[PDB]
Structure formats: structure tokens, C-alpha cells
Design a protein around this ligand. Structure first.
Ligand SMILES: COc1ccc(-c2c(-c3cc(Cl)c(O)cc3O)noc2NC(=O)C(C)(C)C)cc1
Length: 208
């Protein structure tokens, strides 16, 4: 397991998200579904010029999986996935500029719900999760697990869990007071409100 420091700007963003009083936490789900949709758009487009990129799975979809025993909400997609370089280096570089712009916008009167306009909507996960685990598999790279409970660091390891084929699984370990996001009625409500027109099937699993 390798441990990395977030760039200072991203650590600062995460602290703001965790510390700021902001009741409209539900927007985290829209932001993660948006990311899934973007990743799905990417594999779809790439597959038009190289159909073999779908050898790792033809189905393009999003599953939402609540688990009350584990207190997790998992968002699974079959998008393009992220490479080790994406996880450690590339996406952080991009997130640095988006974060700066978002911070400045907040000072100017924007609110946390606008985070996705700055390309860093993922971090809104920390409105509801104490720990986020991201399992991801891109063609031509290995399956990795990224993980962070904030506090300025994240880890990456090669994942020896169940093989995903291709795509990304975001496992939200929910804060004790945010279990409403495990309720079918609540998730359905949020998806209808904010993600009604996403161009891939979203299946909300129910609990046993
Ligand atoms: C907004 O920035 C991103 C959105 C989605 C993804 C993504 C994701 C992804 C990321 C997150 Cl955080 C998520 O919640 C869902 C995803 O499918 N999986 O593969 C992905 N692959 C990439 O898009 C490229 C172009 C970099 C290879 C990465 C960055």
C-alpha cells in the first residue's frame, strides 16, 4: 500500500467541504453520477474507432447499491476507468486549477452546490462520507483501489478483490448521521431531482 499527500490546494478544498456548514448535502450523488456518465461517454466514443476496447465489457450502465449493514452507498459504472497515473498524478494536476477557481467563486458568493462547474465535484463525496474507496480498472492497466479519509493523504494499492472488467466503483462509507442516503425512497428522490436525464441506465438496487 502506497500513501500519498494531496496537493495542498486539494487538502484545503476537502477541509472546506468537511468543515463548512451546508445543509444541501444531497448534491454529492449528482456529482458522482455525472462523473460516471463522463467516463461512460469516453469509453463509448473510444469504442467507435477501436471496438476491441469493449472486450472488457459491452454494457454501459450505472448501479447504485446501498448496504445498511456496511453503512455504504456504492456507485458502480462500466466507464473508461482510471489508470494509476490518473489516480496519483494526472487528475490531481487538473484538480489544482479547478479547486482554485472554485475557492475564489465561493469567496465571491457561490455555494458548494456549484462545485461540478469547476471539475472537482468528486470531493463533494466528503459531505456525506467519512471514507471514500475508489476501485477502478482501465484497459491496459491493472485494477487499483484508491482510498482516503481526508486528513491530507490518500492511499493506492493494486486491488486483489473481485475483478471489475472495466470501470469505476465509488464506495462511500457514510458518516453516522448521513444514513438517509441508504434509503430507497431518498435515493430515488435525489436521482429524479438531479440526474433524470443521464444517458445510461441507472439501476437502484434494493436491500435484502
Ligand atoms: C471530472 O473528472 C473526472 C471524471 C470522471 C473520470 C473517470 C472515472 C470516474 C471517476 C469518478 Cl470520481 C467517479 O465517481 C466515476 C467515474 O467513472 N472513471 O474513469 C474515468 N476516466 C477518465 O475520465 C479519463 C478520461 C481520465 C480516463 C475521471 C475524471
Amino acid at each position: 500500500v502506497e500513501t500519498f499527500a494531496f496537493q495542498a490546494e486539494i487538502a484545503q478544498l476537502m477541509s472546506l467541504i468537511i468543515n463548512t456548514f451546508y445543509s444541501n448535502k444531497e448534491i454529492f450523488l449528482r456529482e458522482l453520477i455525472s462523473n460516471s456518465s463522463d467516463a461512460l461517454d469516453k469509453i463509448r466514443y473510444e469504442s467507435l474507432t477501436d471496438p476491441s476496447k469493449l472486450d472488457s465489457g459491452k454494457e454501459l450502465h450505472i448501479n447504485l447499491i446501498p448496504n445498511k449493514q456496511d453503512r455504504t452507498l456504492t456507485i458502480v459504472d462500466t466507464g473508461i476507468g482510471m489508470t494509476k497515473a490518473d489516480l496519483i498524478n494526472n487528475l490531481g494536476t487538473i484538480a489544482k486549477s479547478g479547486t482554485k477557481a472554485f475557492m475564489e467563486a465561493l469567496q465571491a458568493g457561490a455555494d458548494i452546490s456549484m462545485i461540478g462547474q469547476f471539475g472537482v465535484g468528486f470531493y463533494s463525496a466528503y459531505l456525506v462520507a467519512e471514507k471514500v474507496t475508489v476501485i477502478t480498472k482501465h484497459n491496459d492497466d491493472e485494477q487499483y483501489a484508491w482510498e482516503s479519509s481526508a486528513g491530507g493523504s490518500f492511499t493506492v494499492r493494486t486491488d486483489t478483490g473481485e475483478p471489475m472488467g472495466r470501470g469505476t466503483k465509488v464506495i462511500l462509507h457514510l458518516k453516522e448521521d448521513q444514513t438517509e442516503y441508504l434509503e430507497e425512497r431518498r435515493i430515488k428522490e435525489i436521482v429524479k431531482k438531479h440526474s433524470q436525464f443521464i444517458g445510461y441506465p441507472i439501476t437502484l438496487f434494493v436491500e435484502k
